[PDB]
Design an enzyme around this catalytic site. Structure first.
Site, PDB file in Angstrom:
ATOM      1  N   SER A 152       0.788  -1.324   0.176  1.00 24.88           N
ATOM      2  CA  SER A 152      -0.092  -0.112   0.088  1.00 24.88           C
ATOM      3  C   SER A 152       0.932   1.139  -0.011  1.00 24.88           C
ATOM      4  O   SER A 152       1.755   1.539  -0.801  1.00 24.88           O
ATOM      5  CB  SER A 152      -1.173  -0.112   1.178  1.00 24.88           C
ATOM      6  OG  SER A 152      -2.013   0.904   0.823  1.00 24.88           O
ATOM      7  N   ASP A 255      -9.668  -3.584  -5.644  1.00 25.81           N
ATOM      8  CA  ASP A 255      -8.996  -2.068  -5.053  1.00 25.81           C
ATOM      9  C   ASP A 255      -9.117  -0.933  -5.876  1.00 25.81           C
ATOM     10  O   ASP A 255      -8.847  -1.172  -6.958  1.00 25.81           O
ATOM     11  CB  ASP A 255      -7.527  -2.646  -4.827  1.00 25.81           C
ATOM     12  CG  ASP A 255      -6.449  -1.447  -4.271  1.00 25.81           C
ATOM     13  OD1 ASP A 255      -7.008  -0.210  -4.193  1.00 25.81           O
ATOM     14  OD2 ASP A 255      -5.456  -1.967  -4.048  1.00 25.81           O
ATOM     15  N   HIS A 285      -8.639  -4.048  -1.167  1.00 21.82           N
ATOM     16  CA  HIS A 285      -7.527  -3.559  -0.842  1.00 21.82           C
ATOM     17  C   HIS A 285      -6.962  -3.980   0.636  1.00 21.82           C
ATOM     18  O   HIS A 285      -8.006  -3.979   1.695  1.00 21.82           O
ATOM     19  CB  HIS A 285      -7.240  -1.820  -0.842  1.00 21.82           C
ATOM     20  CG  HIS A 285      -5.856  -1.320  -0.418  1.00 21.82           C
ATOM     21  ND1 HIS A 285      -4.856  -1.479  -1.533  1.00 21.82           N
ATOM     22  CD2 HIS A 285      -5.668  -1.119   0.564  1.00 21.82           C
ATOM     23  CE1 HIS A 285      -3.802  -0.667  -0.758  1.00 21.82           C
ATOM     24  NE2 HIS A 285      -4.307  -0.516   0.329  1.00 21.82           N
TER      25      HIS A 285
END
EC number: 3.1.1.1
Length: 307
Positions: A152, A255, A285
């Protein structure tokens, strides 16, 4: 906001972090039960940064050194630590199941330290690792087979660190980078991609939350086409290619950032960089941080990548 992020926005451009994110203490002793040993090493006291090493127990029953993964946790540039339980546990799983020693970097957080502060901490950590005489590193890590990885926001850091490192590869010896692992890396842009439109009302990362993250993380007054946010002449990719680094990119259709991650993978491929892409249907995500089966499956692919 609290439904999405454990922060309060203050009327002075700052935030407050009123919900404790659990952390796990280090466990350096092999007489403990832990299948992975951990210890923290101070990095820079002026930045209050540190590095947590993860050494899988299995390494203590042979004399072979394992590849070294320099890891950056996620959290929107604004939250979490290398010692946060969710990241500690992922790193322990990764150490055991991908067969790696991990150095997980506790970088500075925004908005107190907006980008590029985390990228500077990434480079400091690389410089520190190369010079380190730490005994876990010297006896159990293979400096010749180093990977930079992140999840991320941490995948954004890992990508920027990788570009900076490629430019100073000779200077990083004895450390030799062999690859980059970008796990659902966080990227943005001023204009919405298709996936950002399709997933605008996502239950965890809706448009306003993503926009907030960038607002708090980028330099004051930048927009989302800033190079820290939107990565795509890419001359840097010539250096990555020339050095023979391989790049893994993973993500999933659920995501909102998928289109940018996939575009980065395509641009790398176009520049002749050896890319291993695994983009899945469904998910959301950070599903691997919650779903042990999905994590297990990723570790299969990461083990082979690192080998």
């Amino acid at each position: 906001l609290l439904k999405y992020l454990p922060i309060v926005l203050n009327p002075d451009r700052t935030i407050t972090r009123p919900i404790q994110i659990p952390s796990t203490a280090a466990s350096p002793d092999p007489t403990s039960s832990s299948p992975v040993l951990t210890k923290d090493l101070a990095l820079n006291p002026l930045h209050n940064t540190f590095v947590r090493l993860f050494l899988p127990r299995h390494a203590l029953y042979n004399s072979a050194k394992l590849p070294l993964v320099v890891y950056f946790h996620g959290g929107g540039f604004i939250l979490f630590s290398a010692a946060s339980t969710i990241f500690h546990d992922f790193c322990c799983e990764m150490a055991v199941h991908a067969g790696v020693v991990i150095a997980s970097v506790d970088y500075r957080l925004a908005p107190e330290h907006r980008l590029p502060a985390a990228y500077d901490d990434a480079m400091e950590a690389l410089q520190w690792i190369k010079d380190s005489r730490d005994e876990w590193l010297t006896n159990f890590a293979d400096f010749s087979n180093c990977f930079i990885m992140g999840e991320s926001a941490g995948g954004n850091i890992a990508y920027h660190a990788g570009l900076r490192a490629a430019a100073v590869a000779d200077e990083l010896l004895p450390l030799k980078i062999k690859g980059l692992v970008l796990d659902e890396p966080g990227f943005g842009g001023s204009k919405r991609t298709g996936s950002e439109l399709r997933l605008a009302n996502d239950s965890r990362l809706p448009t306003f939350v993503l926009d907030l993250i960038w607002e708090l993380s980028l330099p004051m007054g930048a927009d989302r086409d800033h190079e820290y946010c939107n990565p795509t002449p890419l001359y840097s990719f010539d250096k990555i290619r020339s050095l023979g680094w391989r790049v893994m990119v993973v993500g999933c259709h659920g995501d909102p950032m998928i289109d940018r991650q996939m575009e980065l993978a395509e641009r790398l491929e176009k520049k002749g960089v050896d890319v291993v892409a695994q983009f899945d249907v469904g998910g959301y995500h950070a599903v691997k941080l919650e779903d042990p089966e999905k994590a297990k499956q990723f570790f299969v692919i990461l083990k082979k990548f690192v080998v």
